A paper describes a structure:
ZER1 and ZYG11B, the substrate receptors of the Cullin 2-RING E3 ubiquitin ligase (CRL2), recognize N-terminal (Nt) glycine degrons and participate in the Nt-myristoylation quality control through the Gly/N-degron pathway. Here we show that ZER1 and ZYG11B can also recognize small Nt-residues other than glycine. Furthermore, we present the crystal structures of ZER1 and ZYG11B bound to various small Nt-residues and uncover the molecular mechanism of non-acetylated substrate recognition by ZER1 and ZYG11B. In conclusion, we propose that ZER1/ZYG11B not only targets Gly/N-degrons for proteasomal degradation, but it also has the ability to bind a defined selection of non-Ac/N-degrons by a conserved molecular mechanism of substrate recognition and target their degradation through the non-Ac/N-degron pathway.
To understand the molecular basis of ZER1/ZYG11B-mediated binding of non-Gly Nt-residue peptides, we determined the crystal structures of ZER1 bound to either SFLH-, AFLH- or TFLH-peptide, as well as the crystal structures of ZYG11B bound to either SFLH-, AFLH- or CFLH- peptide. In line with our SPOT-array results, ZER1 binds to XFLHVGQD peptides in which X is either Ser (KD of 1.3), Ala (KD of 1.6), Thr (KD of 3.1) or Cys (KD of 3.9) more potently than to the Gly-starting peptide (KD of 4.2). Intriguingly, unlike ZER1, ZYG11B was unable to bind to Nt-Thr, although they adopt similar structural architectures. The free α-amino group of the Nt-residue forms hydrogen bonds with the side chains of Asp556 and Asn597 in ZER1 (the counterparts of Asp 526 and Asn 567 in ZYG11B), respectively. Furthermore, the carbonyl oxygen of the Nt-residue is stabilized by two hydrogen bonds from Asn597 and Trp552 in ZER1 (Asp 567 and Trp522 in ZYG11B). Besides, a strong π-π interaction was formed between the aromatic side chain of F2 and the indole ring of Trp 552 in ZER1 (Trp 522 in ZYG11B), this observation is consistent with our SPOT-array results that ZER1 and ZYG11B prefer an aromatic residue at position 2. Our ITC assays indicated that any alanine mutation of W552, D556, N597 or E600 in ZER1, which would disrupt the direct hydrogen bonds with Nt-residue, abolished the binding to the XFLHVGQD (X = Ser, Ala, Cys or Thr) peptides, highlighting the key role of these hydrogen bonds in mediating Nt-residue recognition. In addition, mutating the third-residue-interacting N553 into alanine caused a significant reduction in substrate binding.
Numbering used by the authors:
A (entry chain B): 516 to 689, 691 to 759
B (entry chain D): 516 to 621, 625 to 650, 654 to 690, 692 to 756
Write the structure that this text describes.
């Protein structure tokens, strides 16, 4: 049982604003950000109100006053990944300042890979909408497309993680041909998470039908071959799990 | 995606204590309890740390010190429902004062006493031996609660899976079955588009058929089960 009402995000952002004007990144502020992160999971209404209650400004301002608060950035970027998974709200993330900050966080060594992983997930969900939808001119899409490839092979594929998935469907919709690097990030996420937490994620992956889509990714000629390697690798880890 | 680590639980009972000692139930405290409620969903470890961080004591003290901040009671009883779904931890809720306040609270719609009836149905699933008020005294009071509630009342509750109430659909306590079936029927009578997919999902229809063919089952529970199945087909 649970409950997420929209007043809750508002109160969390008010407390965050206060602890920002107190220049205090205390446990309670990382806590407010983690609470927004949890509350937004697969619930578009709360991402919408986070956007409407000056959420991006508080994000950037806590980036600015606490440049080396690793777990804060982790929580903020998990929240923003959740926000990026609602595509009709993704237009509000298509400004050169938002995309600049996202791409500049592809190299954050904060909490391992979490900040870079979440920034790259946000940008992958932003790329799934197609090449038409970035009417920003700078930064440029192929510039941080390449930067995303660099981030994805930066990460150790046996890295332990500070993240949890209740469903893989948001990643399993990134089965298309419009953006290969989104697709590659999806395959990487699956590979890492069942390589390091098999007992946890190969049941979830089989359950939601990830194997037919990974097989289809190996069976499409348009698919870039390193994604096909990583998909064959996820398939083999999950098949060894079932066996 | 999400992540709630167990340390977060600590912070809320930390913060609650402050504004329990100043007796100020501001929006942030009703949130503190709502956050504990959310962190407890299908996560036994964080209910463990709520219990081990004298959670029951602040439950009692926030019950009495803020007697009619309904949504505070809402959140607290939802939290306690989440902790009651864990079999390991139900022994710590069997003191006669804990059961006292639970059945005695058998509110913003049904929420408080719906949650009281969920906690008590989950403890009764464990059998008459594991009940060391008296058990069929609170059996009549739980039947009474289920016959109070409007079955098409609007709610402020959320279920991501029906699995906790689908394992109470069993013969050790027929009132488990009655409360679970009532829950399913209210929410699929009223929020079908969200919850009848959830019920098909985990294979509820064969179990409801089995409830219609169960000798231990009371005939109004088979009543509601058969009406649930046909609503699900509708």
């Amino acid at each position: 049982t649970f409950l997420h009402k929209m007043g809750f995000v508002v109160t969390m952002l008010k407390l965050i604003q206060k602890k920002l004007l107190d220049k205090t990144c205390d446990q309670v502020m990382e806590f407010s950000w983690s609470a927004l992160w949890n509350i937004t999971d697969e619930t578009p209404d709360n991402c919408e109100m986070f956007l409407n209650f000056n959420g991006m400004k508080l994000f950037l301002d806590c980036l600015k006053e606490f440049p080396e608060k690793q777990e804060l950035h982790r929580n903020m970027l998990g929240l923003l990944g959740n926000v990026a998974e609602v595509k009709e709200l993704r237009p509000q993330l298509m400004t050169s300042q938002f995309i600049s900050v996202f791409s500049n966080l592809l190299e954050s060594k904060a909490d391992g890979i979490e900040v870079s992983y979440n920034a790259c997930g946000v940008l992958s969900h932003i790329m799934f909408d197609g090449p038409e939808a970035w009417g920003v001119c700078e930064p440029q899409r192929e510039e941080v497309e390449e930067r995303m490839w660099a981030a994805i092979q930066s990460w150790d594929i046996n890295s332990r993680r500070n993240i949890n998935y209740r469903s893989f469907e948001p990643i399993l919709r990134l089965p298309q041909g419009i953006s290969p690097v989104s697709q590659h990030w999806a395959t990487w996420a699956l590979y890492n998470l069942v390589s390091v937490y098999p007992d946890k994620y190969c049941p979830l992956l089989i359950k939601e039908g990830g194997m037919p889509l990974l097989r289809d990714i190996i069976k499409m000629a348009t698919a870039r071959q390193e994604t096909k390697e990583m998909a064959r690798k996820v398939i083999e880890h999950c098949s060894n799990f079932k066996e």
